[PDB]
Curated annotation (Swiss-Prot):
GO term, biological process aspect, one: actin cytoskeleton organization
Entry's family note: Belongs to the GEF (guanine exchange factor) SopE family.
Function: Activator for both CDC42 and RAC1 by directly interacting with these Rho GTPases and acting as a guanine nucleotide exchange factor (GEF). This activation results in actin cytoskeleton rearrangements and stimulates membrane ruffling, thus promoting bacterial entry into non-phagocytic cells.
Name of the protein: Guanine nucleotide exchange factor BopE
UniProtKB keywords: GTPase activation, Guanine-nucleotide releasing factor, Secreted, Virulence
Organism from which the protein derives: Burkholderia pseudomallei (strain K96243)
One cellular component term from this protein's GO annotations in UniProt: extracellular region
Summary of pH dependence: Active in pH ranges of 3.5-10.5.
GO function terms (MF aspect): GTPase activator activity; guanyl-nucleotide exchange factor activity
Length: 184
């Protein structure tokens, strides 16, 4: 309860190191699966991004989800994700979870499964673990692909905060007042 802002943040850090060290030898020894992770890593952000937006109580339906999907796909496209084009809509086949990012999140989840995880501070704290987790994957890759993860990662954060805020703006704007304020 002290401050999930710094607490959960540091707990996730421990997972990242432990796991990073766990499979780091394989990336060096088998510098081939790291590249596969790069694609899945983005997928996790892509899939999680939608889930986070969808889960939010102020963006449950028709609020800005369709738009979030379109904007999310646009940035995830610039990355050049080898997804699948269906009926003109470009969307990844799935596999949001599966790599190290998934493994580190679960570990930190168990320790912080307390009130910390229940605090809203948790939602914004998205780019802390990702910044370190994506860095390791980007390690097996040049500075190029690395920029891609950084670009998409911030873009999502910006899209989410902007879209989430936009939804809240309309919520506060439409709050229980205006509507039931006819008798004002």
């Amino acid at each position: 309860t002290g401050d999930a802002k710094q607490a959960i943040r540091h707990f996730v850090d421990e997972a990242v190191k432990q796991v990073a060290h766990a499979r780091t030898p394989e990336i060096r020894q088998d510098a081939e699966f790291g590249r596969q992770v790069y694609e899945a890593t983005l997928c996790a952000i892509f899939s999680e991004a939608k889930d986070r937006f969808c889960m939010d109580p102020a963006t449950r339906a028709g609020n800005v989800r369709p738009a979030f999907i379109e904007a999310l796909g646009d940035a995830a496209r610039a990355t050049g994700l080898p997804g699948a084009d269906k009926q003109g809509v470009f969307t990844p086949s799935g596999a949001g979870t599966n790599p190290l990012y998934t493994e580190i999140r679960l570990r930190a989840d168990t320790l912080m499964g307390a009130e910390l995880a229940a605090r809203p501070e948790y939602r914004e704290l998205q780019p802390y673990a990702r910044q370190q987790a994506i860095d390791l994957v980007a390690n097996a890759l040049p500075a190029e692909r690395s920029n891609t993860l950084v670009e998409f990662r911030q873009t999502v954060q910006t899209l989410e905060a902007t879209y989430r805020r936009a939804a809240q703006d309309a919520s506060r704007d439409e709050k229980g007042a205006t509507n039931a304020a006819d008798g004002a």
